[PDB]
């Protein structure tokens, strides 16, 4: 009954569903190859590969390499991957340095605007272009997606706890994200956000003053363990959206 | 071509793909197609029209 | 007749959703089909004797 009265036979829409799955995979790959721990983990893991680690069949699919171009194809793709890693090592190091500088500026308060963001974007774009054209496999992609989902679940739990602690009198849950997106650099976010509303002062004093501090400490501890803050959130969000679209198409 | 990319796809919107996902320009319709994955005509053509069984 | 076919389909197969042509095909395969409703010649002669 569910199959019949509810589901409709997709006639000539198989190719459309395949294209939708391909688009979802493209979205997931684009969200993965960005300035976060995924690009660093895929770059650091690929640094050991090629010479003494698994260079092919575990990082980049052999079919995807020569798809647009067995023994000859294996050695050809291996040398190309090694050259790409050797050329992108400096870009990945610069991107990691820029991410560390941005995390320090966000944890201290000072805004790094003297070309720091420009250098970070320039170092991240090179790594993204190198990873996208590398045609990597899904083996490490699965672990990266799992780590991103775990980090996103932890962040969502922390945000929900903060919302439940701050929404006692007259606060809501949807405003917590809007407040933390623009009031995350300063450590006294709950103190410098008391512009209007009497419920905010009561929620910040004796209501959630310790909950907000615990959430900020957890976020600071999780930033060093993996990807930093303010950059990995949107990355995991877009990768989760792509995975959800792919699962819906399937 | 459509008016919505693969990222700005919200709920109650068309999802019929146009073009090649591995190409440069690949977007969807992105119109009022609530209560259905695709739009009216695309869902009709994809849902095995003239259903008599 | 469509309502009667739907009722017959619901009685025979309540879980399956009755259709316009599906219900008409069910009754035909049940009684109007000699492949399933294989009434022997003795049955037909007994019917002809009971009711002329
Ligand atoms: Zn459409």
Curated annotation (Swiss-Prot), chain C:
Looking at the record's lineage, which domain of life comes first?
A: Bacteria
Family statement: Belongs to the RNA polymerase beta chain family.
> Assembly and interactions?
The RNAP catalytic core consists of 2 alpha, 1 beta, 1 beta' and 1 omega subunit. When a sigma factor is associated with the core the holoenzyme is formed, which can initiate transcription.
Chain's role: DNA-dependent RNA polymerase catalyzes the transcription of DNA into RNA using the four ribonucleoside triphosphates as substrates.
Protein name, entry field: DNA-directed RNA polymerase subunit beta
* Naturally occurring in which organism (per UniProt): Caulobacter vibrioides (strain NA1000 / CB15N) (Caulobacter crescentus)
The taxonomic lineage of its organism, from the top, reads: Bacteria, Pseudomonadati, Pseudomonadota, Alphaproteobacteria, Caulobacterales
Coverage of the whole protein, first to last residue? 367 to 418 of 1356
């Amino acid at each position: 009954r569910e199959m019949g009265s509810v589901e409709l036979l997709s006639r000539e829409g198989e190719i459309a569903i395949a294209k939708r799955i391909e688009a979802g995979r493209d979205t997931m790959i684009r969200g993965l190859c960005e300035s976060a721990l995924t690009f660093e983990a895929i770059m650091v893991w690929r640094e050991e590969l090629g010479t003494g680690r698994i260079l092919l069949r575990e990082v980049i699919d052999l079919e995807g390499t020569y798809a647009a171009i067995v023994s000859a194809m294996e050695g050809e793709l291996r040398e190309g991957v090694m050259a790409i890693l050797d050329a992108i090592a400096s870009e990945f190091e610069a991107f990691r340095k820029l991410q560390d500088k941005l995390v320090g500026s966000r944890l201290k308060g000072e805004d790094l605007s003297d070309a720091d963001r420009k250098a970070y974007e320039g170092l991240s774009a090179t790594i993204i272009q190198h990873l996208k054209t590398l045609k990597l496999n899904n083996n490490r992609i699965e672990a990266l997606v799992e780590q991103l989902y775990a980090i996103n679940k932890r962040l969502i739990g922390l945000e929900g706890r903060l919302l439940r602690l701050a929404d006692s009198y007259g606060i809501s849950r949807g405003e917590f994200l809007k407040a933390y997106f623009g009031s995350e650099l300063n450590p006294t976010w709950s103190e410098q956000v008391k512009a209007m509303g009497v419920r905010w002062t009561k929620f910040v004093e004796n209501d959630s003053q310790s909950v907000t501090d615990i959430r900020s400490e957890i976020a600071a501890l999780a930033t060093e363990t993996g990807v930093p803050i303010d950059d990995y959130r949107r990355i995991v969000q877009t990768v989760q959206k792509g995975e959800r679209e792919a699962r819906q198409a399937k | 071509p459509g008016s919505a990319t693969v990222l700005t796809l919200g709920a109650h919107m068309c999802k019929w793909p146009i073009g090649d996902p591995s190409s440069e320009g690949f977007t969807f319709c992105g119109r009022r197609s609530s209560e259905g994955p695709y739009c009216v005509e695309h869902a009709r053509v994809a849902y095995q029209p003239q259903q008599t069984k | 007749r469509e309502d009667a076919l739907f009722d017959i389909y619901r009685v025979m197969r309540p879980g399956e959703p009755p259709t316009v042509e599906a219900a008409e095909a069910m009754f035909k395969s049940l009684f109007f089909d000699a492949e399933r409703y294989d009434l022997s010649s003795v049955g037909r002669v007994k019917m002809n004797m009971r009711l002329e």
